[PDB]
Structure formats: structure tokens, C-alpha cells
Design a binder for this molecule. Structure first.
Ligand code: SF4
Ligand code: F3S
Length: 106
């Protein structure tokens, strides 16, 4: 599985969904997650993230290990997103800000 981590929160560009062949992204108010059973690990999405928030499961940073299980949890509850949309209004003010997990919305 590929994993979306911290920097997608409050940025949510959705460029990553374009490239996904199996459509395993699920959409939350201000973050996207990859469904881990569905992802085929083609790695096509992680060049496409402007926030460079996607990581192969085995490359997730040590301080972001939470995100692996979070993507699994939330994929189960959020709706499937299959088309790109506009980025969140203030997306590049938040791009690169750290600790954005306290801002996640369910
Ligand atoms: S690694 Fe390939 S199948 Fe997995 S979520 Fe990324 S674009 Fe979709
Ligand atoms: S910021 Fe989030 S919505 Fe796709 S493009 Fe990058 S993972």
C-alpha cells in the first residue's frame, strides 16, 4: 500500500486521484486516504502529489507511522473519490506546515 500522510491535510489538491488505476482514494473534508486492500502499489500517484504527502508504506517517515493505520481506518468510512477537483482555498498557505493532524476533520 501507498499511504497519504500529514501534508495533504488542509491542502487536498486531489491531483493524485487522476493517475490511480484502481480508484482507491477516499475523500474526507480536508484530507484523502488510500484504501490498503485496493491499492496495487503501482506508485503512479506519488510523483503527482504537489504536497509530496504520499509514501510507500515501507517508506513512511518514523514520526508519521500513525498515518498507515489512519488511512486504513478512514478508507472504511469515507466515500470513494474518482475525479479531481479544485484544491482547498488556502492550500498553499498550509503546504509544508507541520503537525497538521490536529486539524484533521472526520
Ligand atoms: S500506489 Fe497506484 S493503485 Fe495505489 S493508490 Fe497510488 S495511484 Fe492508486
Ligand atoms: S495533497 Fe492530498 S489530495 Fe492527493 S494530491 Fe496530494 S495526497
Amino acid at each position: 500500500a501507498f499511504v497519504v500522510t500529514d501534508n495533504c491535510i488542509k491542502c487536498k489538491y486531489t491531483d493524485c486521484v487522476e493517475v490511480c488505476p484502481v480508484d482507491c482514494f477516499y475523500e474526507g473534508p480536508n484530507f484523502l486516504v488510500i484504501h490498503p486492500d485496493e491499492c496495487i502499489d503501482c506508485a503512479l500517484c506519488e510523483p503527482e502529489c504537489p504536497a509530496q504527502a504520499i509514501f510507500s508504506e515501507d517508506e513512511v517517515p518514523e514520526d508519521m507511522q500513525e498515518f498507515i493505520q489512519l488511512n486504513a481506518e478512514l478508507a472504511e468510512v469515507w466515500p470513494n473519490i474518482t475525479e479531481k477537483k479544485d484544491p482547498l482555498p488556502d492550500a498553499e498557505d498550509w503546504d509544508g506546515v507541520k503537525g497538521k493532524l490536529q486539524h484533521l476533520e472526520r
